[PDB]
Amino acid sequence: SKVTTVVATPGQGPDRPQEVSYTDTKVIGNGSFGVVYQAKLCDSGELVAIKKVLQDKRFKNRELQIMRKLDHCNIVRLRYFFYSSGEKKDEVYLNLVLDYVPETVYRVARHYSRAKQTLPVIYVKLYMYQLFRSLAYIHSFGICHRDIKPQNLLLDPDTAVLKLCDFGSAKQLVRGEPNVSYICSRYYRAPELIFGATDYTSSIDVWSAGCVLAELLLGQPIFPGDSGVDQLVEIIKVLGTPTREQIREMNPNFPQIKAHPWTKVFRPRTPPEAIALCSRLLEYTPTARLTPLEACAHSFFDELRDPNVKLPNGRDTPALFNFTTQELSSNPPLATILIPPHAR
Ligand SMILES: CC(C)Oc1cncc(-c2ccc3cnc(C(=O)NCC4CCOCC4)n3c2)c1
């Protein structure tokens, strides 16, 4: 019954520290960033995640400032943050107390591939829709995630709620200010980033999302490259060689191969609207890619807007159409498609 009590500021609302008590601490994740724990809150009994990262006193933490201003059903809420000691001697650690979610897209996708099965397309629709909705929301603040990958996409297996969680690579993209090119997980990295682009946009997340979509359809990563130029070689094998104009659009500042047909890339009987969506995300030209809100309105997701749609377990789908004023503001016309007649 070992209770840890800390003094923590709530993620939203006034800067008034309060006592937060928790127990049953266990490791659920780690990385170069640091460590993620699971814990149980003493009062409520609810499970939480505690992300612990190393922190400097003078410089302000970017992830924290990003996470505090996000409030969305497809993003893990920052419940509280607090400072502590850890593995090092004279070092302060930032702790982010977040919503807990019991599964990941990676784990579900791997569990299916271990059984030689493709994930049922209803789950592909549900998870990809919720990813794009979360991206639209964060992109409305000018925030780019910069690390969309199956490992970071959290899942409740019973409700099929998807949640974004890792904002350790995230950044407000200002037009004119340069950004690092070596970002995102390699297999999900936009080709402009491989070309060394420093003036890139939020469309890198859409490319990454497209790689996740393709992976869910294929049962394995679409572009499993080695480091350096070889990741671009993996992309070229499907997309064909990029033209001089496509390179200029990617990085304004060669091995010539024909594009493999999108139908031949995917399995027999992969839904044409899945393939169609994928071809409009995995585009060389970053401006040619769908926006996240355009992606949500794509016909691949029409089954989600059917009033008789259910999860495989027989439950109702999660909240997909409760779009706020803030969500709709980036492209208000799409509200017609996105909020279907029965949800109005
Ligand atoms: C590469 C991953 C570890 O990078 C990250 C980086 N930053 C934050 C996070 C993060 C945040 C909040 C949060 C809540 N649930 C989970 C979770 O992973 N649940 C999945 C389960 C998987 C099975 O074992 C129990 C945990 N969470 C992760 C992850």
Residue numbers in the entry: 35 to 287, 293 to 383
Give verbatim lines from the article:
Glycogen synthase kinase-3 (GSK-3) is a ubiquitous, multifunctional and constitutively active serine/threonine kinase, involved in numerous pathways and over one hundred different putative substrates. In humans, GSK-3 enzyme is encoded by two independent genes that regulate the expression of two diverse isoforms, namely GSK-3α and GSK-3β, with high sequence homology (~98%) in their kinase domain and substantial functional overlap. GSK-3β is a significantly networked enzyme, which regulates a plethora of physiological functions in peripheral tissues and the central nervous system (CNS), spanning from metabolism and cell cycle regulation to brain development. Accordingly, balanced GSK-3β regulation and signaling is key to human physiology but often compromised in diverse disease conditions such as diabetes, cancers, and brain disorders.
On these bases, starting from the INDZ core, compound physicochemical property evaluation and computer-aided methods were applied to support a scaffold hopping approach leading to the identification of novel imidazo[1,5-a]pyridine-1-carboxamide (IMID 1) and imidazo[1,5-a]pyridine-3-carboxamide (IMID 2) derivatives 7–18 as putative GSK-3β inhibitors with improved in vitro CNS permeability. Therefore, we conceived a new scaffold hopping design strategy to reduce the HBD count of the INDZ core (HBD = 2) and boost the BBB penetration of the current series. In particular, we replaced the indazole N-Ha with a C-Ha group and shuffled the ring nitrogen atoms resulting in the IMID 1 and IMID 2 cores. These modifications were intended to reduce the acidity of the Ha atom so to enhance permeability, while retaining the tridentate H-bond interaction with the hinge residues and enzymatic potency. In line with our prediction, 16 confirmed to inhibit GSK-3β enzyme by binding within the ATP pocket. The tridentate interaction with the hinge residues, the oxanyl ring towards Arg141, R2 group contacting Lys85, and a pool of water molecules towards the open cavity and the back pocket were found. Compared to the docked structure, a very good consensus was observed with core RMSD = 0.35 Å, thus validating our models. The experimental binding mode also confirmed the stable water-bridged contact of the isopropoxyl group with Asp200 detected in the MD simulation. Next, compounds 10 and 16 showed none or weak interaction with Lys85, while the isopropoxyl group confirmed the anticipated interaction with Asp200 via a water molecule. Based on the observed arrangements, we may ascribe the H-bond between IMID C-Ha and Asp133 carbonyl group to a weakened interaction compared to INDZ N-Ha, so substantiating the affinity decrease of IMID 1 and IMID 2 derivatives versus the GSK-3β enzyme.
